[PDB]
Design a protein around this nucleic acid. Structure first.
Ligand SMILES: [Ca+2]
Ligand SMILES: [Ca+2]
Length: 314
DNA sequence: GTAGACCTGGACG
DNA sequence: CGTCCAGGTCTAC
C-alpha cells in the first residue's frame, strides 16, 4: 500500500482534486493520443508520468480531476504543485466554448464532437516535444512510444521508482548532443532518427544559441517559429507544426499527417486546388493546413487534435 | 516541384 | 515468410 503506483481508492489521503468536468478533459482521450508519449495507464483509469519534473498519477471522476505526486514524506499535492497540473492541461481554456464554436461552423465536427468530448491540447516543454516528435516521423505510435521511453531511460535524469518502473526526466540538450549518442540511439532502435536527434541537439547548442533560442519562440510568431524549427535535422513541416501547436503556444498550427489527409478526403471531400500535386506533397500539405485554419479559426490546431484523436480510436 | 528509400516491427494474404 | 504502412524528412534530377 505504501509502495507501487497509487490509486484513488488505496491511498485516499494522498490525493488532491481540481474541479474539472469530463466535458473539459478526458484523460483516456488525451494522454495516449500521441501529443505526449510519456503517460501510462499503470492501473485502470489511472495515468502516471512526469510533469514539472516530478512523477504524478492522475485519475478522474465525473466532475473532478484527482492528482497525486511522488517527490520526502508522502503528502497530498499542494496548491502550487496543483497549478503545475492546471497549466499542463491549459485549464484556463474552456473546451466547451471551443467545441461549440467549431461545431457551429463545421457540421461534421459537430457529429464527431458528441462522441469525443474533452479532447484538449497539452502545454508541453519545447525540448521534450521537439525530440519526441523528431521520433514520430514515418513511424507508428506504439513504436514511437518505446523509442522515447528508452531514450529517456538512457539519457534522462533518474527520478523515482514505483513497482518495477523507474521514471526518468526528459534528456537535456547537452546529454543529447553528447559523444556517441547517435550510435547508442541506434542500438535503442531509433533507426535513422538517431542521427536526427544528436544532429538537432548539436545544431541547437552550437549554431542557434542554445536552449534560449527555442524557448523564445513562444513569444515569436507562428510563421517565424515554424520556419526556424524547419532548420533542424529530422524536422519538416509536420513535426514543426506539432511543436508550434503543442509546445510553443501556436493554437492555429495544424499538423498535416497521413491521418489528417484521410480525414480531409473522407469527411470533407477535400482536394488540392492551388497546388499542382494530386496527392501528399510539400505544397498540398500546406494548402490543407490553411484549409483547416480557414474552417476552424485561430484554434484550428486544437480542433485538429479532436479529430486526430477520434481517428486513432478507429 | 517530384519519385524513391529509409530504421523498425506489427498487421495483412 | 514477404509487401504496405505508420503523426515524414531528405536528397537526387
Ligand atoms: Ca506514412
Ligand atoms: Ca528541414
Amino acid at each position: 500500500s505504501e509502495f507501487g503506483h497509487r490509486t484513488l481508492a488505496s491511498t485516499p489521503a494522498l490525493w488532491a482534486s481540481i474541479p474539472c468536468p469530463r466535458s473539459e478533459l478526458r484523460l483516456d482521450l488525451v494522454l495516449p493520443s500521441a501529443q505526449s508519449f510519456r503517460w501510462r495507464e499503470q492501473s485502470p483509469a489511472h495515468w502516471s508520468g512526469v510533469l514539472a519534473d516530478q512523477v504524478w498519477t492522475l485519475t478522474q471522476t465525473e466532475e473532478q480531476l484527482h492528482c497525486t505526486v511522488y517527490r520526502s514524506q508522502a503528502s497530498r499535492p499542494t496548491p502550487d504543485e496543483l497549478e503545475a497540473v492546471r497549466k499542463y492541461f491549459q485549464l484556463d481554456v474552456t473546451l466547451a466554448q471551443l467545441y461549440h464554436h467549431w461545431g457551429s461552423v463545421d457540421s461534421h465536427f459537430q457529429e464527431v464532437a458528441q462522441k469525443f468530448q474533452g479532447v484538449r491540447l497539452l502545454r508541453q516543454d519545447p525540448i521534450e516535444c521537439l525530440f519526441s516528435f523528431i521520433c514520430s516521423s514515418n513511424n507508428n505510435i506504439a513504436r514511437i512510444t518505446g523509442m522515447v521511453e528508452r531514450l529517456c531511460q538512457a539519457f534522462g535524469p533518474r527520478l523515482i521508482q514505483l513497482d518495477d518502473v523507474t521514471y526518468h526526466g526528459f534528456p537535456s540538450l547537452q546529454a543529447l548532443a553528447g559523444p556517441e549518442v547517435e550510435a547508442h540511439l541506434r542500438k535503442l532502435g531509433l533507426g535513422y532518427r538517431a542521427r536526427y536527434v544528436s544532429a538537432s541537439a548539436r545544431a541547437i547548442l552550437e549554431e542557434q544559441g542554445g536552449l534560449a533560442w527555442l524557448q523564445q519562440l513562444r513569444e515569436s510568431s507562428y510563421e517565424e517559429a515554424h520556419k526556424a524549427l524547419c532548420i533542424l535535422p529530422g524536422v519538416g513541416t509536420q513535426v514543426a507544426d506539432c511543436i508550434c501547436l503543442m509546445a510553443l503556444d501556436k493554437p492555429q498550427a495544424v499538423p498535416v499527417d497521413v491521418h489528417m489527409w484521410h480525414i480531409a478526403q473522407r469527411d470533407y471531400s477535400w482536394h488540392p486546388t492551388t497546388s499542382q500535386a494530386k496527392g501528399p506533397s510539400p505544397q498540398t500539405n500546406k494548402e490543407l493546413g490553411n484549409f483547416f485554419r480557414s474552417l476552424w479559426g485561430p484554434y484550428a490546431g486544437w480542433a485538429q487534435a479532436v479529430l486526430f484523436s477520434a481517428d486513432l480510436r478507429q
